[PDB]
Amino acid sequence: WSSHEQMLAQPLKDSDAEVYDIIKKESNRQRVGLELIASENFASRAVLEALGSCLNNKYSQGYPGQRYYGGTEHIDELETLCQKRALQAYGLDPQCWGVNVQPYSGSPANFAVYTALVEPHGRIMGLDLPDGGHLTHGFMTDKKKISATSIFFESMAYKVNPDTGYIDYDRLEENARLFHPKLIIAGTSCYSRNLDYGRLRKIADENGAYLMADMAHISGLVVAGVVPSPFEHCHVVTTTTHKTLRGCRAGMIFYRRGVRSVDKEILYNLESLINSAVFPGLQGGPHNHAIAGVAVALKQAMTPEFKEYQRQVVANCRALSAALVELGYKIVTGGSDNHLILVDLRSKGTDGGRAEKVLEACSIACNKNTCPGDKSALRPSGLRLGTPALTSRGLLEKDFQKVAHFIHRGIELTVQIQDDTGPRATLKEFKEKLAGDEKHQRAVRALRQEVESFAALFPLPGLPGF
Amino acid sequence: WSSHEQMLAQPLKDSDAEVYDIIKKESNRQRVGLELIASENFASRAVLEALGSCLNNKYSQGYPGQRYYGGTEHIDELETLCQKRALQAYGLDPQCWGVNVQPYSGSPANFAVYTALVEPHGRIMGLDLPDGGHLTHGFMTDKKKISATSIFFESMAYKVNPDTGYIDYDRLEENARLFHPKLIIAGTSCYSRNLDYGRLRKIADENGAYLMADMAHISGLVVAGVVPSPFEHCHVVTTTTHKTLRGCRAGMIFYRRGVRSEILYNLESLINSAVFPGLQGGPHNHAIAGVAVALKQAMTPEFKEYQRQVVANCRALSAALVELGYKIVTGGSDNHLILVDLRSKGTDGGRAEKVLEACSIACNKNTCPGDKSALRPSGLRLGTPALTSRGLLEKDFQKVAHFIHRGIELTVQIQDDTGPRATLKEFKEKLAGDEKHQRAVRALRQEVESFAALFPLPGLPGF
Amino acid sequence: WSSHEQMLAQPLKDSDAEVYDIIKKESNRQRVGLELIASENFASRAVLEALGSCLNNKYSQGYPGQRYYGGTEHIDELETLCQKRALQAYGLDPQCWGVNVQPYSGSPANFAVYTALVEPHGRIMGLDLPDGGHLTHGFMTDKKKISATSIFFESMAYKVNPDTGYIDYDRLEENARLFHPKLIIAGTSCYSRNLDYGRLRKIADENGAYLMADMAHISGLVVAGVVPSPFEHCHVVTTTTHKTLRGCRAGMIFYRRGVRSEILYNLESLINSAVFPGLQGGPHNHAIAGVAVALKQAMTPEFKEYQRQVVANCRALSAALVELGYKIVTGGSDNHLILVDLRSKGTDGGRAEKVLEACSIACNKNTCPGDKSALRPSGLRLGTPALTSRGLLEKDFQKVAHFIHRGIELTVQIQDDTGPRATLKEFKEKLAGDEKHQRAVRALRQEVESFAALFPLPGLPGF
Amino acid sequence: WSSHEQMLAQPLKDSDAEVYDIIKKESNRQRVGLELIASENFASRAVLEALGSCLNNKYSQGYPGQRYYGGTEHIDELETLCQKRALQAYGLDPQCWGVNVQPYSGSPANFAVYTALVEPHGRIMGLDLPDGGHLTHGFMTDKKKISATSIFFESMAYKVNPDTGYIDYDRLEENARLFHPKLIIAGTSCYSRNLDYGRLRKIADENGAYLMADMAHISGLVVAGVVPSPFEHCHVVTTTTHKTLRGCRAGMIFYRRGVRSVDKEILYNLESLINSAVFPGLQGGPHNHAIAGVAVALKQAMTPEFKEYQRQVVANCRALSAALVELGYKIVTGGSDNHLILVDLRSKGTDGGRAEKVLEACSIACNKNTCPGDKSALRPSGLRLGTPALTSRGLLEKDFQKVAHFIHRGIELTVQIQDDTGPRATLKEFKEKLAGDEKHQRAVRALRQEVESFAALFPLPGLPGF
Numbered sequence A, D: 001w002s003s004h005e006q007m008l009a010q011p012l013k014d015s016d017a018e019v020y021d022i023i024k025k026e027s028n029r030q031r032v033g034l035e036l037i038a039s040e041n042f043a044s045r046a047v048l049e050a051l052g053s054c055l056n057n058k059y060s061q062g063y064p065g066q067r068y069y070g071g072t073e074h075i076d077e078l079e080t081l082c083q084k085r086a087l088q089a090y091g092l093d094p095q096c097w098g099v100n101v102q103p104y105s106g107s108p109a110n111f112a113v114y115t116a117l118v119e120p121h122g123r124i125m126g127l128d129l130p131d132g133g134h135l136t137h138g139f140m141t142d143k144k145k146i147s148a149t150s151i152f153f154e155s156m157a158y159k160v161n162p163d164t165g166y167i168d169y170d171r172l173e174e175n176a177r178l179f180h181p182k183l184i185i186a187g188t189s190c191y192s193r194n195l196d197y198g199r200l201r202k203i204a205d206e207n208g209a210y211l212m213a214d215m216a217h218i219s220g221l222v223v224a225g226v227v228p229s230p231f232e233h234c235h236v237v238t239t240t241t242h243k244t245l246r247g248c249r250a251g252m253i254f255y256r257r258g259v260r261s262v263d264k265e266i267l268y269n270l271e272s273l274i275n276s277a278v279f280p281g282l283q284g285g286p287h288n289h290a291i292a293g294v295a296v297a298l299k300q301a302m303t304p305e306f307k308e309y310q311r312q313v314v315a316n317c318r319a320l321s322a323a324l325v326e327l328g329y330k331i332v333t334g335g336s337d338n339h340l341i342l343v344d345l346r347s348k349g350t351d352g353g354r355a356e357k358v359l360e361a362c363s364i365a366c367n368k369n370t371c372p373g374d375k376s377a378l379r380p381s382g383l384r385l386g387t388p389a390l391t392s393r394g395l396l397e398k399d400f401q402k403v404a405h406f407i408h409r410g411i412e413l414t415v416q417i418q419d420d421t422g423p424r425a426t427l428k429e430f431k432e433k434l435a436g437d438e439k440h441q442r443a444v445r446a447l448r449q450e451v452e453s454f455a456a457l458f459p460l461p462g463l464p465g466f
Numbered sequence B, C: 001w002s003s004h005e006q007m008l009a010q011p012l013k014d015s016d017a018e019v020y021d022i023i024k025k026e027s028n029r030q031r032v033g034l035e036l037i038a039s040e041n042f043a044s045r046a047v048l049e050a051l052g053s054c055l056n057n058k059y060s061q062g063y064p065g066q067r068y069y070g071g072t073e074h075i076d077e078l079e080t081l082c083q084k085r086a087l088q089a090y091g092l093d094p095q096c097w098g099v100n101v102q103p104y105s106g107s108p109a110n111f112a113v114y115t116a117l118v119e120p121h122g123r124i125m126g127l128d129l130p131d132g133g134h135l136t137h138g139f140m141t142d143k144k145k146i147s148a149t150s151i152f153f154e155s156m157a158y159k160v161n162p163d164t165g166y167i168d169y170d171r172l173e174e175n176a177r178l179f180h181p182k183l184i185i186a187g188t189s190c191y192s193r194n195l196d197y198g199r200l201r202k203i204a205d206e207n208g209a210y211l212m213a214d215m216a217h218i219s220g221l222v223v224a225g226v227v228p229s230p231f232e233h234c235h236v237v238t239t240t241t242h243k244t245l246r247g248c249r250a251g252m253i254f255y256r257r258g259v260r261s262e263i264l265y266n267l268e269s270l271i272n273s274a275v276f277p278g279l280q281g282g283p284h285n286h287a288i289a290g291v292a293v294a295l296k297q298a299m300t301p302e303f304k305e306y307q308r309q310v311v312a313n314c315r316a317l318s319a320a321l322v323e324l325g326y327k328i329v330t331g332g333s334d335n336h337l338i339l340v341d342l343r344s345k346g347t348d349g350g351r352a353e354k355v356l357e358a359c360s361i362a363c364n365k366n367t368c369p370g371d372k373s374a375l376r377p378s379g380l381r382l383g384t385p386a387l388t389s390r391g392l393l394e395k396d397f398q399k400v401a402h403f404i405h406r407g408i409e410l411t412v413q414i415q416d417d418t419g420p421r422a423t424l425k426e427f428k429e430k431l432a433g434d435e436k437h438q439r440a441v442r443a444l445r446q447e448v449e450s451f452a453a454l455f456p457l458p459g460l461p462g463f
């Protein structure tokens, strides 16, 4: 009873040794590994410190103008500030753009938008998952609706041309006339090229639909001006605050304000619809500590250092890509305009399914992903590789060329093991063959060692070993 | 780059002076004010430290043993551990109960459950908002569906008896037969009494519906065994991890496993699939560690003692207000809060909350079962969790009751000066634009803040 | 071809002997039986002749002045005329009322209205089936939506007070506030009392809902002014054109025009668009002519007198049964039918309807407000429209009451012989497989049919 | 009060002179006009006599096995008989096919099927309206759902290739994979070619969807074996009972029974779902007089005379088509396989919108319809012409060649008037110019005379001038 007050003041290290130890091991794992998973990054110490603030305590349902409770003087300064920085970072005129900074994450932001502009059973069109689309843009089969987007709304995907790897805008244009979407989504999870927002706006307008961009993956590149901005043609732009923006996990919803079209002119009614959908529609108390973190990240994102960082991200990807091509690997669309590339491993006689597991055992992180061709999702041919994470650690072109070779050594190893299993062997048997065969296990150990020694050469953003 | 590395290692104080200053002022505001808003609390230093961990960086869609990406060895140890502590804290047998610890907050947890068990347009019944219910349990008018629960599903509320302030279980029993709910919700935002879970389970079973408890507000009291547990009769229990549980903001979904009545439970896979890949993306592992830390602290006898104190304080605050002539809805409370009917003093919570706020006494308005209009709620909701975390005891809450009373008297004054009939905007002007009054506020604020500064403020060292 | 032309000019008797024979036997069955099924009637020769017209051949999608195809000069004269007579028959000012005469039947008319005013998942409230409501007003269980109304829309029933047999308007008033209906239905399939349309309009307005009356059963009584008109308080009135109106099978949708409360009515275009191109295709013009013919006949004093006789007969039949010791739900009736609670004789409508059928006395079972099980309805619904069209008067219905009584006694007998507890299939065996009994049936059938043959059978000359 | 009994026995002629007169004028209109509207026909006297039977009186909700009331001995003989004849007429084995004969019309039958197999918001794919599809197969715009099919369900149309006029099965195959239909509809309102049911079954099976044929327009041709049967590949076949089947207005639902697929095999659950949807789902008391009419029509449809009639129907269409082609008219898909043709009037510098009204004034009935090309529905280029109606009146090839010339004289007249109005004149102005200009009005009168004199040469099926 007396120690209750001490309990509240006791550091994590002393209070919960078990959780503390987990964080420590995790921190060390991140340090000695090579992060190539495209959606991964490292938040700055500043951002992380914001999350532990007393901002966790205040309930502030509503918005700066109208909150359900009082005592929000400072919470209001914060959310207002965060909104100012968000618009600023993207060179947006507050008279043409507004922004909601309360979404809990990327998926919640998207859903708030659908709930506001689409409504139950409204039609939505998004990039097909196997072609690089995201779950939240629609995901269903001929017998079931899996994603909440597909469950509560009516979704239909649009594909990429498998012979070029590019989104087939022509086919989408024709299909939109028959499907009658209320909203079209411009955003991807695994696509290395810029999106033709202008074309998509024409198609959207033609069908009277809204054009929503989900820039989650390129949000950081956009700020630095390294890839064309989606704010030029879209009505709404959703995004995560982590990934390439490098903040804590959260989301934001940018929306247009003012005149939409002439004749006499009609206006944008996006603002109130979106805000009401976020609250009291879908969420409760906003997570202010996360809003401060996002704010901090937005300030850092406007610095020339961040600008230079993003140029480096894209340059590294180009270098990594060229080095892999020189090694004989096939890159979808032949290359990239951004931070990632999709490597078609068919060019090496294997698949991303087996490759990702072998590379993981070597402490090289990345993930499998189907290539536009692929006649089966149960054996994706590609590997998605992104440069954001390692670039935040200071890796430059030369470093990524060395990384390309580690990955290659990995693919060679994966091929070795596969040939040692059989043509009709299962992924489970493959994984087991890799775990219980000292022969391959020796190869793994040796490559892991080089991979981790090379990784330890670079700093690990965050708190002092936390 | 030279400076790029340092930008990422730089402290918040130096990196972003503006945000830092805001936190500082906020920290100070919390310190000198008296927090009586029932859903507020103070997270421990340990919990807050977890949020700043490198756990922020890892993407772990899926679940332990079912991850999309590799490299989740430690994230798995964490989520698994968090689940173990969640079941443990509530004395739940892992063969009868399972738990999802990925919800981003209270509302997201509820929605995941509806999406899993109810499905589009499925019927849901919950306590009517004006009678103390929560938005996420249903909120619509005769012309519009406001809450996402009411938009994507078909909701119908059940009311409390305005003459007793208690949920009218009889009427709910009759209406369930006509409405045919697929799910009934047992949980509140402003109700001072224990819920008759057993009765609700009978009604749910009768209609073949699921009984979901939303213990967000009493989750902490439940752990300490200070109020009956909803795990005894419900099929599912959702909850926030903050509020009375005192963790960081997040949510959890407890669900039954095993035999239901041979017929088994299919809750687990439905709920997990709804959370992901259904509604969410990457879980927030730093928040999961925070919840884990909070669950360990919640099993300590200190936490147990804390919760007893919370309820004792509420009883004391309640008695002191009754002695001062205030009317408490249902006459008293079984938990951490009370709904004070200000009609007994000739005013409303709408005007009272603003005057008390100006005096640095935080609380909020809320309609009382009677109330013939939501635009003039008669009550004030007051909770003891926050101040109890600061060490306040019965004697302290009696002093607090007096400050609140001085406040009510002041609100009434600004009311007599405005006339028996005046808008709320007129009242506020008289409050902020009257020598004697703005002066009255200043004087009470001073005493309120001096008394408040006598107690410690949980959290990180010095902001 | 030589014979092809004649095949199309050939009479039914020569063309299809098998179908012809069926009609003949059916015609004879109708002649020698006693029709007491409340929804049955006999269409006049004039009405039937219209159905065989060349009006069958013309496709006229759309409406007068709004046709898809040309060549509708006469179809337009017809539909326009039919609309004029419909409004006229009910004393409706064409500036306050409009009417759609294309519905294929009663159910299609109701559905068109829901589709127009309610829309997918919109809420609808109607009388509970077991309390005398109609399928199309809502029909679902706790596990399944059976009626298309319950499948495409969200329905919730309102009940009658089992102690009085009257619709409990108070409870409906309270439930409407919680359910938030978009449309409330005033109409029944088995209810002997007038509906409190005024009360229902107050409740509808309070919730901003539309009040739709489904007068299918009393449409004829309404025309003759024998029961209060639903056109006084409702916004929409749907109806079958057969039953008590005595036309061919079809339906109509009456809707208000002008000012509702400035706010006007938008019913017309919504309803018309829902019927077409919404739900139907080419209208059945031969049926529209039949309805027109029936509406002209319905405005004659002869029809007026007929309807008075219908209600008088019901009163007489009712009194004779009461004198015989039978219990009538709500004690009596205001219209053409009565619901007889057979519990007062130790049996149920389920067994009674089958025995009476075997005696050539037609009627059907129906649950009484009390009834603790639909698998053993206690009542028998009896209507006087059909026999009244055959000329039966009070004295005749008293004789009919006795035949029915002899029937009930017989059903009870087959019941005593089967034991206080026996399935329905056992009862039927004893009925058809017992010297004394099948013999009892034969004897009563004979008297029933001899008495029935004393009256004329409306329709075409000789089939 | 006394005459009440007389009132019930009074003939229509004496009872309601006004309605009687209308029928008479209508009967005469049908006699002197030339019916080319593809969905029109003339019911036989036998069929019409059935409609006036005492069958109008009996309420029989439910089905032969289970009715809500008793006294259905004969109604049961009737519905049972009608079902037997329906299956028989189409050479269907009652162990593989079942049939519901209670639908009130064509549209109600389709809706009962959607309600049974698709369910609320289920996806449905049908031929696009402007390409010859039917309303009940789906009809919506980018802002509104008009047809009840589009309101209660989620529909998406599939188009015909505008360069060939044929349904583009390839595109439909691709789109079905993205749309995930639960049911695909094979049926048309204005399409002159046979449907590739086999191809559609492959596509349906691929997506696990049901294949429903709506043979309303070719139902009669199918019975006579003049066009391939949809019962060979479809799971369900809906149809009107009038149109080419020549019965009274009603509808039927044919559905498969027995084994569906192997592996071990799964069965068809269509029967109970469809029956329950019709009742107590959507309808109330069946219209027995209409069921007898359908029965009578089904018996007549199995006669060699009917068989010969249908061959004549198709031969006439071929002749009408050739005569119009020789006159320089463009027929969509170049010709027809059935009872109708879609004439593209662009080949004559006018549209079906103006043409249908001029031809109507000349007592030549037909209707406008957009041609696959058409860049606007507000000016459809085609005229749909069917031969069923006139063929029932005995018209043969020579007769249809004369009809082709009357129609041509009509088109020439329509062109004359249009040129007399202006390039940007409205259809309303065109219609008014045709009604208030004695010059054109004289042309109309003269052609009408020839048209009606020639029409009076043939018999008019039905009752003696009724």
Ligand SMILES: *Cc1c(COP(=O)(O)O)cnc(C)c1O
Pocket (backbone or CB within 6 Å): A039, A105, A106, A107, A108, A134, A136, A187, A188, A189, A214, A215, A216, A217, A240, A249, A250, B280, B281, B282
């Ligand atoms: C990652 C990603 C998301 C999901 O973000 P969460 O924060 O995990 O919920 C949504 N959309 C796109 C385009 C993404 O890349």
Ligand SMILES: *Cc1c(COP(=O)(O)O)cnc(C)c1O
Pocket (backbone or CB within 6 Å): A283, A284, A285, B039, B105, B106, B107, B108, B134, B136, B187, B188, B189, B214, B215, B216, B217, B240, B249, B250
């Ligand atoms: C507070 C509360 C919630 C909402 O929690 P959030 O974390 O704000 O999103 C849900 N349900 C009940 C019963 C509550 O008290």
Ligand SMILES: *Cc1c(COP(=O)(O)O)cnc(C)c1O
Pocket (backbone or CB within 6 Å): C039, C105, C106, C107, C108, C134, C136, C187, C188, C189, C214, C215, C216, C217, C240, C249, C250, D283, D284, D285
């Ligand atoms: C009979 C009846 C109906 C149904 O009419 P149908 O013509 O059978 O389709 C609808 N509503 C009420 C109130 C009825 O009595």
Ligand SMILES: *Cc1c(COP(=O)(O)O)cnc(C)c1O
Pocket (backbone or CB within 6 Å): C280, C281, C282, D039, D105, D106, D107, D108, D134, D136, D187, D188, D189, D214, D215, D216, D217, D240, D249, D250
């Ligand atoms: C005509 C037609 C219909 C409509 O029939 P109705 O009886 O008018 O309701 C439905 N489907 C198709 C394919 C048609 O040709």
